[PDB]
Amino acid sequence: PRHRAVNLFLQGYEKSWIETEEHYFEDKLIEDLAKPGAELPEEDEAMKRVDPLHQ
Amino acid sequence: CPEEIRDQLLDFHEDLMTHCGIELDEDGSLDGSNDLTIRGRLLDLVEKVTYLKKSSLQQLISETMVRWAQESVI
């Protein structure tokens, strides 16, 4: 128990195997929730907000 | 006489890819499971890390962040 190459092996496994699935999964949901539409502005203004992605 | 007389020294000349690299090559030789009795435990722990644990904290942070960014322009 005196060498840390096992940590590097685990890091390589993490960036190799699960990283592809994480990239294929994380990119969709954030864009789906970019416009949830739950909060109506409830204001008598014609500013016509679209998304926080515009910000 | 050596340990094994299979071809030269060992099975498939274990000395060649054993003495060439121990700190790096030996660890990289474990390309996947079906090698020893610890591959199942390693796969179980790798799956055990990735539950997106926090999950309540992460979802509450995301919800409150969307709520902050959605109510008005900041």
Curated annotation (Swiss-Prot), chain B:
Tissues expressing this chain: Highly expressed in heart, lung, cerebellum and brain. Detected at lower levels in adrenal gland, stomach, thymus, esophagus and ovary.
Localization per Swiss-Prot or TrEMBL: Sarcoplasmic reticulum membrane
Modified sites of kind Phosphoserine: 44
Disruption phenotype: Embryonically lethal. Embryos die at about 10 dpc, due to defects in heart tube development. Cardiac myotubes display enlarged rough endoplasmic reticulum and cytoplasmic vesicles that contain high levels of Ca(2+).
Superkingdom per UniProt: Eukaryota
Post-translational modification comment from the UniProt entry: Channel activity is modulated by phosphorylation. Phosphorylation is increased in failing heart, leading to calcium leaks and increased cytoplasmic Ca(2+) levels.
Note on domains (UniProt): The calcium release channel activity resides in the C-terminal region while the remaining part of the protein resides in the cytoplasm.
Function text: Cytosolic calcium-activated calcium channel that mediates the release of Ca(2+) from the sarcoplasmic reticulum into the cytosol and thereby plays a key role in triggering cardiac muscle contraction. Aberrant channel activation can lead to cardiac arrhythmia. In cardiac myocytes, calcium release is triggered by increased Ca(2+) cytosolic levels due to activation of the L-type calcium channel CACNA1C. The calcium channel activity is modulated by formation of heterotetramers with RYR3. Required for cellular calcium ion homeostasis. Required for embryonic heart development.
Family that this chain belongs to: Belongs to the ryanodine receptor (TC 1.A.3.1) family. RYR2 subfamily.
Subunit structure: Homotetramer. Can also form heterotetramers with RYR1 and RYR3. Interacts with CALM and S100A1; these interactions regulate channel activity. Identified in a complex composed of RYR2, FKBP1B, PKA catalytic subunit, PRKAR2A, AKAP6, and the protein phosphatases PP2A and PP1. Interacts directly with FKBP1B, PKA, PP1 and PP2A. Interacts with FKBP1A and FKBP1B; these interactions may stabilize the channel in its closed state and prevent Ca(2+) leaks. Interacts with SELENON. Identified in a complex, composed of FSD2, CMYA5 and RYR2.
Protein name: Ryanodine receptor 2
Organism field: Mus musculus (Mouse)
Gene encoding the protein: Ryr2
From-to range in the entire protein, with total length: 1987 to 2074 of 4966
